[PDB]
């Protein structure tokens, strides 16, 4: 469009004869997401909801991606094994890690999903040490309305990283920031949605109430939904993972949607209030295998491509069969090296764009019981 | 610092023998600004308060900087003259505009203040037309805690511009975003502070309550102050400026600190509640000349370099004498071309860094009446 | 307002409150005034004569929402 060709008709709130007051008022009333954020970006964006995923980012590991090679980990493996709490499965194997990364990318390509690649500097560091956990790009997933700078609860190696990913998203995709979390703890990228307007959080090492309130207030205003609901799990876990029980600080390890009103769910996830809410709202629960969960095979860390189709860890045999039994297609992907730190396959995927999908009303209206 | 030289002692919350819970809790308790935002940026930043200004940005005008040369202005001068409401003083003169820009920069340099320069693309445009008002870099001033994406109330030509300036600040200065305003209207960069923890807003074309609440909640958490106060003016004005009265939608045209508990103030600014609050809190008021105000010479659009020293428009002779009479040094700078649109000298300065300065308690404790 | 609302002979009673920028009775720099009767007055059903120094944004919004037509007084007068 030519620079001298612009006319008043190109301003949506303009109309012939409008008064100053009326024009200003119309401007105050405009929707941020659809008037400002998306037009200025030149595109739609946000991973909210349970609709069709179209666009993600992965990190291809280098030696610096390996948590067990940080000088601080070498100084005290037990300090980090406390924070993370995941079972010890041996040193990370860089080459096998690279191979399961390729395998995941091929699965995305075979399912029509665009994959961006994120690289970090050589010898990447924040003010407090080598980066750690920076393979887990879910921590930088993009919301309707924009990116988020997180307050990490347990992993100091992620300081600087949500900034890096949000800046990457702005420079590479033109996607703006929505909010920085500035109190408590909130790691929104490890949360998941079970309907278009329903968010699952935890109260845990990774989330306190003040952090949660700050995040939810920001994303609810750009959610593109009339209502916004937060289901809050209350897992019994000190750090990230409780290897005695399978309980986890992160929603994405506790629960995930597999279809409209169908969830895969950990045995260590649901307190009575959470169970009641899910019952009242007509959600069908597929319980993950208890051993797969407790051993941290991440059977609930599935990535919903669209209602009825998920990527899952190939060795979660029992949970995956239960998912298929519930009518859901499973794309099996190797995910073993990734689980030597605090996450699985879904945890390592930065979600950029998911198309609007089924609503809580849809879930409530499904006749199944 | 070497990549393999990092130790646990370099994590502030770490100490020998700390439990997982205790380490996580210490991390949840850390101050965002001083633990995360500033260390990750590698510097301090924010224009909050009335302390010593050290760092700003200006825009050197090109033909595209001129509001009266937008194709939309050419289509209807009266539409934009409605929105802005400033007196017609003739076409903007590009060369004279460039010269008063140089003069302002020289004043900064002579006062030990670093000046960055911001350029826009050729033929700069947002989704709704040519940029307009983008010389007014105050709209991108940086807060303690980070940058802000604004919701402009009256000027569609500024859509995209607060984004551009915040992205510039991140890429050029490594200064992160704090928040996007996503409801109503809020133009925080045109607000001013009259003590370290006291912000002046308006309710006007440029600010509604919902926008205000969103902004204040965000900046109060990173303010670095125990309390945070918002004085809210209620000017009688439809657009930006009321040429019958001198009333203005923007705080920076209504009022500004010139020293500790000394303010320059428009005759059209103070309703009874605002007057009462200022009286109770021991603020001395220097009233701007009524004619200078009403004619939009911007006598309150002074820039505080530090308590007791301001830059002011050279032709605000009467207001400037009153400022000198109140013991304040005035640096007179030409500012005539700038005032053909919605702002003066302070309005065109992006403030990046101001050192912490006097508090509300300081103001209250000054003995003067 | 509490006293006059009880004898108003009306189901509801509303108070629109202007917030003029004036120290005493009158601000000769602006035309702002401490008294409503100098700021605004009805001239017909939902038609008001109104000073340029009278209406803050909230007052303007309320009058707009309630369908009042504003005739602006001459600024010099
Ligand atoms: Cl109107
Ligand atoms: Cl768009
Ligand atoms: Cl403890
Ligand atoms: Cl620092
Ligand atoms: Na916020
Ligand atoms: Na009485």
Numbering used by the authors:
A (entry chain A), B (entry chain A): 11 to 379
C (entry chain A): 226 to 302
Q: From the publication, what sentences describe this entry?
A:
Mycobacterium sp. JS330 produces 2-nitroimidazole nitrohydrolase (NnhA) that circumvents 2NI activation, conferring 2NI resistance by hydrolysing it to nitrite and imidazol-2-one (IM2O) instead. The initial characterization of NnhA indicated that, unlike most other known enzymes that degrade nitroaromatic compounds, NnhA is a hydrolase that functions without catalytic metal ions, molecular oxygen, or other cofactors. Despite low sequence similarity and limited occurrence in a few soil-dwelling mycobacteria and Actinomycetota, NnhA maintains the α/β propeller fold characteristic of GME superfamily enzymes and forms an unusual hexameric ring structure formed by a trimer of domain-swapped dimers. The residues in the active site of NnhA appear somewhat conserved in comparison to the ADI and DDAH, with the catalytic histidine, glutamic acid, and cysteine residues present in NnhA as H260, E197, and C357.
We also crystallized and solved the structure of an active site variant NnhA-T2I-G14D-K73R-C357A, in which the presumptive nucleophilic cysteine residue had been substituted for an alanine residue. To investigate which of these cysteine residues is likely to be the catalytic nucleophile for the reaction, we substituted either C352 or C357 for either alanine or serine residues in addition to the T2I, G14D, and K73R mutations. We found that despite soluble expression, C357A and C357S substitutions eliminated activity. On the other hand, the C352A variant still retained activity with fivefold lower catalytic efficiency than the base NnhA-T2I-G14D-K73R variant, and the C352S variant also retained detectable activity despite its poor soluble expression that prevented protein purification for detailed enzyme kinetics. This suggests that of these two cysteine residues, C357 is more likely to be the nucleophile in NnhA, fulfilling a similar role to the nucleophilic cysteine in ADI and DDAH that are conserved in the same structural position. The two catalytic mutant NnhA C357A structures solved in the H32 space group also adopt the same hexameric structure. To better understand the reaction mechanism of 2NI hydrolysis by NnhA, we tried to co-crystallize and soak 2NI into both the active and inactive (C357A) soluble NnhA crystals. However, no excess density for the 2NI moiety could be found in any of these structures. The only notable difference between the apo structures of the two variants was in the conformation of D262 at the active site. While D262 exists in two rotomeric conformations in soluble NnhA, only one conformation with a slight displacement is seen in the structure of the C357A mutant of soluble NnhA. Hence, it is possible that D262 has mobility within the active site, which may play a role in the catalytic mechanism.
